[PDB]
Design an enzyme around this catalytic site. Structure first.
Site: not given
Length: 242
Positions: A177, A145
């Site tokens: 996420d 991420k």
DNA sequence: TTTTTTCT
DNA sequence: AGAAACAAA
């Protein structure tokens, strides 16, 4: 279904994503403010360093990036690591996991020091290289991420200081996420990385530009300033995702 | 637990 | 691979 979402996102286009990025996105506003108060090279270095500690926040992203932008305006920054060692422990919106976050900045400082203006131009022309290079310096998977979003945020910063536009690469995904997992579950049982890469490729809008569109629309940002045709397509996407 | 990461 | 990192609700 994927096909209807891709059709509407294709009609919104990179043009629509860019409009939201440059007019509505509060992280872009914060970056524009800071870009006027510090030299361009340090500006980009700080933006990448900031992205790499922008996980598990104690505030919303837009609060955090404005905190960052206002803190660094006008400052005399030498070591990025030393600057964050002072900044982070006293921040309001990024109080968790600080020792770990500080060590990431220490580890990336050498790579950040390569970011001359010319190297910044080269990476903005080849953001896939930047993506791989950030990951290599941290010793991590570029799919992660914060590495993906450091490329996204680098792209905003570079667009501002170079006053030119290159689209994000099609190959850089929306990464997993919790919030993209939650949104995607509403729409499909497909896993998000595969789902949004298929939609990106079908629509012609790279995944990171799709990311720019999703979150303001879900968070209730007004689309009323968009001109009538784009406004209609934005309104059609809100009907699908909200 | 929920709102990403290291270490190895 | 997965425990542990750290603040709040």
């Amino acid at each position: 279904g994927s096909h209807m979402i891709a059709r509407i996102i294709g009609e919104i286009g990179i043009e629509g994503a860019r409009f939201i990025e440059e007019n509505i996105d509060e992280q872009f506003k914060a970056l524009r403010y800071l870009s006027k108060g510090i030299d361009s090279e340090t500006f980009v270095k700080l933006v990448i360093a900031n992205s790499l500690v922008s996980y598990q926040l104690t505030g919303k992203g837009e609060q955090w990036w404005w905190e960052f932008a206002k803190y660094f305006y006008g400052r005399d920054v030498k070591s990025i690591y030393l600057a964050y060692k002072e900044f982070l422990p006293n921040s309001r919106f990024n109080r968790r996991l600080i020792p770990q976050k500080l060590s990431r900045i220490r580890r990336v400082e050498t790579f950040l020091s390569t970011l001359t203006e010319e190297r910044i131009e080269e990476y903005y022309g080849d953001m896939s290289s930047l993506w791989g290079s950030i990951a290599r310096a941290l010793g991590v998977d570029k799919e992660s991420k914060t590495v993906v979003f450091s490329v996204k945020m680098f792209g905003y910063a570079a667009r501002i200081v170079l006053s030119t536009f290159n689209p994000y690469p099609m190959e850089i995904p929306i990464p997993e996420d919790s919030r993209i997992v939650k949104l995607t579950k509403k729409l499909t049982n497909e896993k998000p990385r595969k789902f949004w890469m298929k939609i990106a490729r079908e629509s012609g809008v790279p995944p990171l530009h799709i990311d720019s569109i999703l979150w303001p629309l879900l968070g209730g940002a007004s689309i009323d300033s968009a001109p009538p045709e784009l406004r209609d397509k934005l309104a059609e996407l809100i009907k699908i995702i909200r």
